[PDB]
Each structure stands twice: as C-alpha cells, then as structure tokens.
C-alpha cells in the first residue's frame, strides 16, 4: 500500500562570487525537482490539488534541506549543491551565514553519515515531512495523517528487516526531524531577509514560496 521500494524510486528519479547567491540558485532549481518528486510519492497525486499545494508550501524547506544534507555525506565540512558546486564551511561563514550552515553540518549531514542513512530512509523521512497533518488549511487532515502513518510503519518494518542488529535505528531517524524542523525555520528567516534587503538575486519559484501566506 505504501511500499518503500516505490519511495526509493522517487528519490532515484530525482538524482542529478557570493556563496548565498549560488545556494539560492540551487534552491530554485530543486523546487521544480521537488514538485516532480512529490508526485512519485504514492497517493500524493491522489490528494486534492489545493492540499498538494498546502503540503509542499509547508514543507519545501525541510524537504530540500534533507535532500542536500544526505547528498553531502562524503563531503568534508561542506555541502554539495544540486548545481554541482561544492560549498565549504569557511565559504558560508565568510558570506555571513556560518551559524546556520554549521547547524546543517552538525545536526544533519554529520548525523546522517555516522549511521550511514540509506536513500530509502531519507526518502521515508522526506515522505513523513511531506504528509504533515499539522499543515494549516488542509481540507481532510485525517487523510494526510493516515498517509503519514503508512510511511513510518513501512519505514519501521524496513528498518527491522534491513538493519535488525540496530534496534533503535527507527527512532534515531525520527529524532533528526525536530532538528530538520528547527533548521528549516531558520532558513526561511534568512531567505525572507535576503528578500527584504534585495542584495541577493532570487529566482521566480523561490520568490513564490516566500510570498504570503
């Protein structure tokens, strides 16, 4: 009903002077890819069109952040952007965004690497974030809650089977989500500020996610 093999295929179908300008460029590019990603997640396309909007608008940060963090596993003190460019710890710090960059590095990338999070687990965590019943405006929130329940039950059962020696790997995965949430909110703030000041080029799709509400 909610197969981890299908969620994995959604992830695999998606694989490709101012550092902040380069990071925002990569963000906009991935927003298009994210919409295509969401569709490949079982039952998401079957949700009403308005609810698909509400879901993607509420989680786009966390969804994108999870993606470039897992991509950056084999990177020393930095992140690999979707554009192909690497961005190092010092490059971001010198751009005046080192505090949040280090949070991404320490709380996600690093934590992902040490447990060697696979693409199926990354996909499931992303799918859990996607099916957020707490998203305001949702027409039928219980339907979105039920789809979340099906993703994590599949993820647990995937974990108990693929890594049966690590009895607490399931909870370990789920406990990166508050960090992702916290880091996601702090990104929005930054992005709102890059907008307010106007010293950073911001492409059309990224600009639309920064429009109200």
């Amino acid at each position: 009903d909610m197969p981890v093999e299908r969620i994995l295929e959604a992830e695999l179908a998606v694989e490709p002077n101012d550092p902040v300008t380069n990071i925002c460029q990569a963000a906009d590019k991935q927003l298009f890819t994210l919409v295509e990603w969401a569709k490949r997640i079982p039952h998401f396309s079957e949700l009403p069109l308005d609810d698909q909007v509400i879901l993607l608008r509420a989680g786009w940060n966390e969804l994108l952040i999870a993606s470039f963090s897992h991509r950056s596993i084999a990177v020393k003190d930095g992140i690999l952007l979707a554009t192909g460019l690497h961005v190092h710890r010092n490059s971001a710090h010198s751009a005046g965004v080192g505090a949040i960059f280090d949070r991404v590095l320490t709380e996600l990338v690093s934590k992902m690497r040490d447990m060697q999070m696979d693409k199926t687990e990354l996909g499931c965590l992303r799918a859990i974030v996607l099916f957020n019943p707490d998203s305001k405006g949702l027409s039928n929130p219980a339907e979105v809650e039920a789809l979340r329940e099906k993703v994590y039950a599949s993820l647990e059962a995937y974990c108990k089977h693929k890594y049966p020696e690590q009895p607490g790997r399931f909870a370990k995965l789920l406990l990166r989500l508050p960090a992702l949430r916290s880091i996601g909110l702090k990104c929005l703030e930054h992005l709102f500020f890059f907008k307010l000041i106007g010293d950073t080029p911001i492409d059309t799709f990224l600009m639309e996610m920064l429009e109200a509400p």
Partner: peptide, 11 residues
C-alpha cells in the same frame, strides 16, 4: 495565488 506551483502540479 501560487502561480508557478499550480502549473507544475498540473497533470
């Protein structure tokens, strides 16, 4: 409201 997103969620 959300122009680009709606157009991409189409089909």
């Amino acid at each position: 409201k959300h122009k680009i997103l709606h157009r991409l969620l189409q089909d």
